[PDB]
Design a binder for these strands. Sequence first.
RNA 1: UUGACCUCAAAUCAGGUAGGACUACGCGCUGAUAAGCGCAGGAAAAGAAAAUAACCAUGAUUCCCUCAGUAACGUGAAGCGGGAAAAGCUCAAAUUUGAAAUCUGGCAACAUUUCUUUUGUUGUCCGAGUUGUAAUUUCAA
RNA 2: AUUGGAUAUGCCAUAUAAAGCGCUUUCGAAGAGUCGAGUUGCAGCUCUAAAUGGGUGGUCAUCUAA
RNA 3: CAGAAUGAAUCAUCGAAUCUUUGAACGCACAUUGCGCCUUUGGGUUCUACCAAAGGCAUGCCUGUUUGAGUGUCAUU
Lengths: 120, 70, 166, 186, 369
Amino acid sequence: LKTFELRKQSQENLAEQLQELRQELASLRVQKIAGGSGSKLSKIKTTRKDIARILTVINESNRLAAREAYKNKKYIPLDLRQKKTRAIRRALTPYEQSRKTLKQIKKERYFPLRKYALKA
Amino acid sequence: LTSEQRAERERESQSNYADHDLWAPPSHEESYNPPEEYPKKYKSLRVVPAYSNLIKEKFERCLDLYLAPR
Amino acid sequence: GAYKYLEELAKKKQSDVNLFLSRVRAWEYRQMNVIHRASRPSRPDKARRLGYKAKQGYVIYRIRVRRGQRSARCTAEERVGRYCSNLRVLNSYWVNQDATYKFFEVILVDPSHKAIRRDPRINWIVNPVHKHRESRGLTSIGKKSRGIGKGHRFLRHNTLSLRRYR
Amino acid sequence: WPEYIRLQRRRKILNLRLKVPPAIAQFQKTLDKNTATQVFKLLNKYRPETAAEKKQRLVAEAEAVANGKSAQDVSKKPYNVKYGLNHVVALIEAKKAKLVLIASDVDPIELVVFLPALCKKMGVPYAIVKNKARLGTVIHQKTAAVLAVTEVREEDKNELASIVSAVDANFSAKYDESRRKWGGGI
Amino acid sequence: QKGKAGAARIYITRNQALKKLQLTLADFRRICILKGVYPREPKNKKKANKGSTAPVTFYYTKDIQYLLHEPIVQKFREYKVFARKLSKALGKGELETAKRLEARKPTYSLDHIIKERYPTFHDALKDIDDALSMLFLFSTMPVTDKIGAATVANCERLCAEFQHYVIRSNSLRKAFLSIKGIYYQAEIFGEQITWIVPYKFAQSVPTDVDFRIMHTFLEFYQALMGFVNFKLYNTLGLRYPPKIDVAKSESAAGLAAYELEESNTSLFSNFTFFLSREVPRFSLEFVIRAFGGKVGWDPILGSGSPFSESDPVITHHICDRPHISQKYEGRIYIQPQWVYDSINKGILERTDLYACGATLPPHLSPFVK
RNA sequence: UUGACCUCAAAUCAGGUAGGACUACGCGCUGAUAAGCGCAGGAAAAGAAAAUAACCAUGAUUCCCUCAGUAACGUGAAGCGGGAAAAGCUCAAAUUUGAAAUCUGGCAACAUUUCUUUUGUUGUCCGAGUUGUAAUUUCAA
RNA sequence: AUUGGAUAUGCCAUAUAAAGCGCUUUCGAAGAGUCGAGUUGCAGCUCUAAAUGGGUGGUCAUCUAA
RNA sequence: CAGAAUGAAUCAUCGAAUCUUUGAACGCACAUUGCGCCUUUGGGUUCUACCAAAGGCAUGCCUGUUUGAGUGUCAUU
């Protein structure tokens, strides 16, 4: 099913759409032990992928509603943090990286590396 | 907020008495001159004394709802 | 201040005052654990001089070592650094000894504490190159041990250098 | 007994059973109850301003400047007791302090062990009082180590010349041989 | 193996409820007055008490575990911290931080604890009798140590608001002057409610009622008195709380002080009655305002009286004193027994029956049938 | 009875943190350099002289060529010179004493993003800190 | 589309401030069971310093460790 | 090969998600097979019973919070 028009209906409407999509699949594996046509094994394929679309849809309507829940907050849970690299999450941030004393603040506003030239 | 503002923004507060809506046995014919039986009979309301047992009775009823079972 | 008087007093280590506190504190240090946390540095001047600022994130430990063959002070940096897996070692000095145990303390710094991380005089140790400095012989007594100094006192030939044109 | 209490009574007694050097011996003989209730009465005028209400006077100082007024031209030199170990060693070496107060329970005792010797040399009348925390309560602190009056106003100079005379006459005039002999070994 | 389920699972002891909540006796008794939990007896207590036979109080586990998520339990423990911060301030001589923290003394809110226990306002109207009676109870006694002096003003304001709103809506229907006092039976928003009020006498401390438990129970009743006033004034269009005239309060005008400004009920409406300084004119004016009658009083009875002693507009100048030397013409001196019967029978009772110097009849209970 | 303070505990308390894998190259440990143990990064170790020199002096460290298979005692340098690259500095020790000027944390607003996932500012309340957090200074001064 | 250091320009800033160098009738703090000697396999054990001092090199030169 | 045809693609890119049991492996023991505990919710016409689901329960250490203990140091007309 076209995934752009799955998001246009609320969460519970995806809810009752979920199981009979399974009850179709749950009934469709019974016909394999029964023995039938070969085009329903294509229907086996496209019912799992259609199961695997709504579950992608409903899960992204939970986490994206959680992100709007956790605005402005000092602490957010783990699953909504960055997953870059352990050595990247636990290293210095360019604020703290670019923090200086007061001594190196004075020594780089009266004496910075200027731009100059020469004459060959 | 400045020093006077340190004072007067404390004064509109601390007035909190239900500023928003939350909801979106009987007497036995006993009086001063009860003639059904002959407690006591009082001729005048000014001559009637103060029943001091009401403080112990109302507290017992209040304590019954929280400590006595039902 | 008081640190001038407390440096010259800490040198007269065998005199009557420095010996009485030696017997007393060696008693209390011995009934405590082999590694036990301090709350204040016993020598608040030597600790202050070796790097310890008295802010949150600076942790003083102290550990006895058996006498009698890695240098004892080096192992006090390692054994505390294996007991604290998060804290970064700065230094480790001598505070007491007896006939059977040398007592040291160690200065340890939390690299995750957002008070070390915001301070540009100790921010060099948040960097990941300083992971277990006491292991690599990279600290005050691990440098002296391995002859890393400046002076005539303290494979580069064993390979043949075969250039292109020769 | 718990694992730590049987240490907590024994380091109480090993300070008694051993030989205390005369430098440390004077740190248990201590200013009495009586004369240690007037020293803190004189000091309880000269407390440092509480850090919350120093700011309170600073917002009342910085609001009139934002209009054009001022008080820096008419601000008289402040007063309080002077505290901190490193600030009071320099207040004795400069002969500025007039009454040094030493706590009797500083945990590394070397922190204050040179002060009764420094106060004897620089001529600053001194006394050893109890309970470092008692000094800490004076200056809005958890544990203070030492205090010092260096300048009370003209109001309490006549009181201060009397209360020092109680400090020498009870601590310095007495306690003159127990500081000159070893202690402990009881 | 018994001792795992059955009665002993759902049923558990008083001490075990201290262990599973981590409170003490004075902490446990403190909270279950605001929140409604009463002991529940099993049908078989030996099996429920895991085989033992001691007399032991028992509790469902479905309420003692519903207690766990309540944030008010956090306020009590964060009231423990405060006094151990104030005593740290007071014990170190710092007077100013002792002043700066009592204004920000942490106070819980009584909003969400009245939400769940009384769902319906009509159900809240049904359980407004004992709370309003307690509001009318402590509003006339002297200041007690465990009782709140400021809450006494709240007890004075809430009962007057309950008196003014009922008088404005004419909600009072039955009234009896019993031996204890004046029991007022009203009906607001459908629910018929009866409230008993005693006479203003020189009371004394009983020295047996737990004022600590009373101050907690009064706080549970202080919210319902205001929340109903938040509802009744909104229902009647008045202000919640209504504007109170302090000058009329300093002159003891009663409901006239609390101005109800908009934000047989006519049994004695055609009877402008006045009063002397001989009876409880506070409830007499409330009975007159509920029955539509104009209430006058003497200056000694209280200021703000619309009708004076010399006013000829007194339809029935009732005097509790049998000797009325200043009984005016057209203002025949009657007794409160006739007015109480007038409030009982719902019609203009015979003033000649219970007159000043006449025999008062036997006053039966208005709630009786 | 009560209250501070010190020490020691307890908590599925709040927030964090440490193991383990690769190990060509790095740095240590003992070690017949091999093996074993430990520990990091894109490089690491080294580093701004308690260094050479005996000159008309050189000037942190690293690396290449040379010194040189030379001095010194089969092993075996280093100074000088020639290159590549060059960047310097930060604390402790002196009282801010006319004012702990310092900082973590909790809450609330304002932003902000490699990012609704990031990173901060401001207000406010504890707390840390006078057994010393900032400003100042590091001998070239 | 993310990002670099810059250029010009707009708004803010709070500067009652901070910094370079003359000039000094003034002061000038410097890291210890470490240095060091004895002695077993740079470590171990015994002992334990000083302020023109201490270190390494030819009375001098040169450096300022813990 | 059938397969549907008419956004096809075992396509490419890829920034949102899914990731079974184990494994540093972490509620306990083990090699399988189990044993549990706490909170919440739901269920089948009962939370007096029962089951299920969901969320948690390793250790050491750091910072802060709360609760304490100490014949540990003191003050309290």
